[PDB]
Write a protein that binds this ligand. Structure first.
Ligand SMILES: C[C@H](CS)C(=O)N1CCC[C@@H]1C(=O)O
Ligand SMILES: [Zn+2]
Ligand SMILES: [Zn+2]
Length: 218
């Protein structure tokens, strides 16, 4: 699968299973993905969107559809596609989780700050939905984290992980190209049985996206 769009087509949600959807927004056209987790205690997002306008629209779409409030967002690094809606989150009383380093970089770059509560490994539970966050090391950015749903073996790779359609490393201004492969290997070592991998940009895939990223780093 079910795919549902906003009137414009700039925001789309695609169902992976009964309680997990991918959200995708176009920023001006460049698509960006996160997750929507439908839990018994509210909606939890992995990542916001490019700006406040899109973040507001995303929240409004999912609250209406799932008939509950967005309570929490996990911010996976301090680039605009991930954190651009932080002002909206904070003013609505939506908890914005991040590592301390992500918060430090957000502040440095003039964004409002997320909580800085996530450690190298953090285990969260929202209703019955289990979420693990993992900092595997530097790669796409110094601060990038991945998000794991152990009840589904779904990995949110974020922008650390390239989609099949990506034929080069893309934006390496903030990247650590000599450490990115080790960081991917750390993800592969931690999660040895993966059902789906959601990249930050592009189509959902599987463990092959991690291997693709390794190949692009050669
Ligand atoms: C503006 C975003 C922030 S991750 C960006 O750097 N992009 C989006 C598509 C390609 C490029 C990248 O992730 O390498
Ligand atoms: Zn980025
Ligand atoms: Zn990105």
């Amino acid at each position: 699968k079910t795919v549902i769009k906003n009137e414009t087509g700039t925001i789309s949600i695609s169902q992976l299973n009964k309680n997990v959807w991918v959200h995708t927004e176009l920023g001006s056209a460049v698509p960006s993905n996160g997750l929507v987790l439908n839990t018994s205690k509210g909606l939890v997002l992995v990542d916001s969107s490019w700006d406040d306008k899109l973040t507001k629209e995303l929240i409004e779409m999912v609250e209406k559809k799932f008939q509950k409030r967005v309570t929490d967002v996990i911010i996976t690094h301090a680039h605009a596609d991930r954190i651009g809606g932080i002002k909206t989150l904070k003013e609505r009383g939506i908890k914005a989780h991040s590592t301390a380093l992500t918060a430090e970089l957000a502040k440095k770059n003039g964004y409002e700050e997320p909580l800085g509560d996530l450690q190298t490994v953090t285990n969260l539970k929202f209703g019955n939905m289990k979420v693990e966050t993992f900092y595997p090391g530097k790669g796409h950015t110094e601060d990038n984290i991945v998000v794991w749903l152990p009840q589904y073996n779904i990995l949110v790779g974020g922008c650390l992980v390239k989609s099949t359609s990506a034929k080069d490393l893309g934006n390496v201004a903030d990247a650590y190209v000599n450490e990115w492969s080790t960081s991917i290997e750390n993800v592969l070592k931690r999660y040895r049985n993966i059902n789906a991998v959601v990249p930050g940009h592009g189509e959902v895939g599987d463990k092959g996206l991690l291997l693709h990223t390794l190949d692009l780093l050669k």
